[PDB]
Amino acid sequence: PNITNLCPFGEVFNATRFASVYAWNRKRISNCVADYSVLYNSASFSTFKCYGVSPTKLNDLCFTNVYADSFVIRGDEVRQIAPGQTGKIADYNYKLPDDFTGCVIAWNSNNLDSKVGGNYNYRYRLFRKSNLKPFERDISTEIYQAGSTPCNGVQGFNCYFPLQSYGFQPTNGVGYQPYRVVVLSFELLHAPATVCGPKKS
Amino acid sequence: STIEEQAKTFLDKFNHEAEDLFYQSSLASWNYNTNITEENVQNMNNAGDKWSAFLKEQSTLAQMYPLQEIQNLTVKLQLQALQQNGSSVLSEDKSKRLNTILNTMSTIYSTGKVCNPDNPQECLLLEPGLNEIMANSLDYNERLWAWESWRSEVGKQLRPLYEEYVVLKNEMARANHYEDYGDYWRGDYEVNGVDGYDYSRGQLIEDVEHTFEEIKPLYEHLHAYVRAKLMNAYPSYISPIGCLPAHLLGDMWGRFWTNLYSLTVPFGQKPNIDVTDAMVDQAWDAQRIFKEAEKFFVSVGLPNMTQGFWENSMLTDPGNVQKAVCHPTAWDLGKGDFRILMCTKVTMDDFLTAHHEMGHIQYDMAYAAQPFLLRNGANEGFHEAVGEIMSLSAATPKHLKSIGLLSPDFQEDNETEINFLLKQALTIVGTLPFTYMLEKWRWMVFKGEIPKDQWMKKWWEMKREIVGVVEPVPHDETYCDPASLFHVSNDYSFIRYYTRTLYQFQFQEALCQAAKHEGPLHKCDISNSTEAGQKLFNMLRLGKSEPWTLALENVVGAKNMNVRPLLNYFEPLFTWLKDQNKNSFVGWSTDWSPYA
Ligand SMILES: *[C@@H]1O[C@H](CO)[C@@H](O)[C@H](O)[C@H]1NC(C)=O
Ligand SMILES: *[C@@H]1O[C@H](CO)[C@@H](O)[C@H](O)[C@H]1NC(C)=O
Ligand SMILES: *[C@@H]1O[C@H](CO)[C@@H](O)[C@H](O)[C@H]1NC(C)=O
Ligand SMILES: *[C@@H]1O[C@H](CO)[C@@H](O)[C@H](O)[C@H]1NC(C)=O
Ligand SMILES: *[C@@H]1O[C@H](CO)[C@@H](O)[C@H](O)[C@H]1NC(C)=O
Ligand SMILES: *[C@@H]1O[C@H](CO)[C@@H](O)[C@H](O)[C@H]1NC(C)=O
Ligand SMILES: *[C@@H]1O[C@H](CO)[C@@H](O)[C@H](O)[C@H]1NC(C)=O
């Protein structure tokens, strides 16, 4: 069959702006044909680690929906976007389930997301009372209470603001340079699967 | 909840907002150093003021968490580092007076120009006007004039200033729960709370005396040989039974004896190992010097330099139009940015300096995983020692033959090893009594052992007793002879060089034993040895997280600084010097026998 209506992967990977890791964007991809070989054969990605499925058979399998979660993290924090990991990003910003089927794609973005004065537009949640559940988004800006005293709204002693900005300079090391991460989540539900791979001729 | 969790959250908040501010300060300092312009000076000053004010506010916030309720060693170490008052405990009037005194001493030392009376039309500054005269002249009265005139002007200006400085620093230290300023300096080596690895501030003086008592025979034989050669050079001034005249040691203060290698050479007719012409013939650029250094560090197993290092470092002099500081410096700017600022020439000295500074860079890179306030050396000695070991390994004839800079048929006989060891002794052994005597004198001044009216009578008495160097003419109390040196006049600790020198050869023995070198210690090269690099990197990765005693256990297997590796390094030279001193008299007399 002649195929059209490819899945819109251009508006996620080639987006002019990415979201912050605390407020990571989720785009639901449905009712199209997903060509995954375009992503896999690209040389622009530093991490293309797939958990629970292999990239070769992605272009054949069919899924109900594809969830594209997009954010920016540091170079040293790409390791924490994996099942079972521990860190600031995993516990307080973006948590992946252990039974996760999907792919974590990350690439260096020092060219776009770093400016000479410092790019402070990307923020991360540094403190939360409890760890996040898998696929939870916390965009609350309530003052963290680290001590018995009632914070009472004011940032004083033992009371800190949970969202801390990130500093991005072009001269930083590879472990501090901004990395754009897109996590694709593949699920199969009782509804008929509509995100199928292309059928080769 | 608990105090410890509160301190951990506060430390996370600190490390996060302090790494970026430190990076801004460091980047402004780099932009000043590579580009000396007034706006860059203003930007550097503004960033430094922001950094200092942020540290003051974080220290003020940090003091509110009591130390005794924290059991985690790393958290306690960071809180101890942050909670230090420094000069903040002192009153604002006295703090401003102390800062003014420090600045004016810096200006007097840096901008001090002295020349001969009756010829005042032009005068010579310390660098390089007086350095060249002290290092290269062979005239007795010229060196005497330069030495006495510089100590007359600088000491007579700095003596009241130093008298105020000792009182203010003692006041700050006693306000900070220390006995004196000497205890404050010795507190860098203080380890408390670790079972068995504890080190006391009072143990440092005892360990330094205990090591120096074993240094003394080698130094006495070296002093006798140098005395005989200087007696040959200057026929009547130097006595066979007395101390060396102060102005004849090849440097302004007596810090190094390395400028006497030409006068005191054992075998002048035999060649040196200078490789400068070989690099010039093969057109070695500064980039090739750093690439060869990188090859050396990957040979031993350490990580290679980052992309940011090659892109952002300045390894060549920029030009006449753009002004830069010429001093070689390794910069850990923060956030994974490591750079070397060196005006590299095609010389052996620059090549060894490149190895030394890349060693500093490797040490900085190793503890990047550690928290921000623990990103330092375990003590002040280790940071310099890890560069000096690379300098030691690179200068060996085996490394030079391996990298192609030396001919493979170059003959390494005993005479070349003797003269090389003598040069290393003049640089390394000769600085040890001067360093120990200077620090002991400053500790006794801070402790109050020496009253203000007896500072110089004791000082020369110490110099005759320890260094074996006599004053050319007597000096009264209007002189301030110690403060003519850069470190003492600008409030710097001086025991780091003594500790660095001992740690250098302890590390060298440990790595050479790890690398299975089977010969003399000075002939040892640590290239191609993965296990030696692993043993080094185990200590390198710790940074300031662990006590320096534990780090030394990690490398050499000892819990304390030791003097036997240094003596083992210079054992061929020690036997040769003992043989050569049969006619002459080893040791000196403290009396005024040569000249006074
Ligand atoms: C995104 O940008 C790269 C850069 O050239 C381009 O080759 C690619 O086709 C774009 N789209 C996707 C979906 O990767
Ligand atoms: C050095 O400073 C001058 C004057 O601000 C500027 O024009 C020049 O581009 C700078 N060069 C570098 C390498 O920073
Ligand atoms: C001390 O705190 C660090 C956090 O920096 C933690 O990783 C470590 O396990 C703690 N050590 C102990 C003995 O609790
Ligand atoms: C620092 O100074 C303050 C004010 O005098 C004092 O309360 C605090 O105990 C001092 N801390 C240390 C470590 O000396
Ligand atoms: C440093 O070493 C790694 C692995 O050995 C290598 O991939 C990298 O290219 C090296 N760096 C440079 C600048 O060549
Ligand atoms: C060097 O070795 C030769 C060969 O035995 C010996 O004659 C000479 O005295 C030695 N020189 C020194 C300085 O040890
Ligand atoms: C170290 O290893 C390199 C690469 O194998 C080799 O060329 C070099 O000669 C070795 N060094 C020595 C001293 O043998």
Author numbering:
A (entry chain B): 330 to 530
B (entry chain E): 19 to 614
Question: Which text from the study accompanies this structure?
Answer:
Biolayer interferometry (BLI) analysis of trimeric variant S proteins revealed limited (no change) and moderate (~2-fold) enhancements in ACE2 affinity for the Kappa and Delta variants respectively. To investigate a structural rationale for the observed changes - or lack thereof - in ACE2 binding affinity, we solved the cryo-EM structures of the Kappa and Delta variant spike trimers in complex with ACE2. The focus-refined atomic structure of the Kappa variant S protein in complex with ACE2 reveals limited structural changes at the RBD-ACE2 interface. The Kappa variant E484Q mutation results in the loss of an electrostatic interaction between residue E484 and residue K31 within ACE2, likely resulting in a weaker interaction at this site. However, the enhanced electrostatic complementarity afforded by the accompanying L452R mutation may present a compensatory mutation accounting for the lost E484–K31 interaction. The combination of these two opposing mutations, one diminishing ACE2 affinity (E484Q), and the other increasing ACE2 binding (L452R), is consistent with the unchanged overall affinity of the Kappa S protein–ACE2 binding interaction. The same L452R mutation in the Kappa variant likely did not result in an overall change in ACE2 affinity due to the deleterious effects of a lost electrostatic interaction from the E484Q mutation.
The Delta and Kappa variants of SARS-CoV-2 co-emerged in India in late 2020, with the Delta variant underlying the resurgence of COVID-19, even in countries with high vaccination rates. Herein, we report cryo-electron microscopy (cryo-EM) structures of Delta and Kappa variant S protein trimers – both in the unbound state and in complex with the ACE2 receptor – to gain insight into how their mutations underlie changes in ACE2 binding and antibody neutralisation escape. Within the receptor-binding domain (RBD) of the S protein, both the Kappa and Delta variants share an identical substitutional mutation (L452R) with the previously emerged variants of interest B.1.427/429 (Epsilon). Finally, the P681R mutation (present in all B.1.617 lineages) immediately precedes the furin cleavage consensus sequence (682-RRSR/SVA-688), with initial reports suggesting that the P681R mutation enhances cleavage, and consequently S protein post-fusion transition.
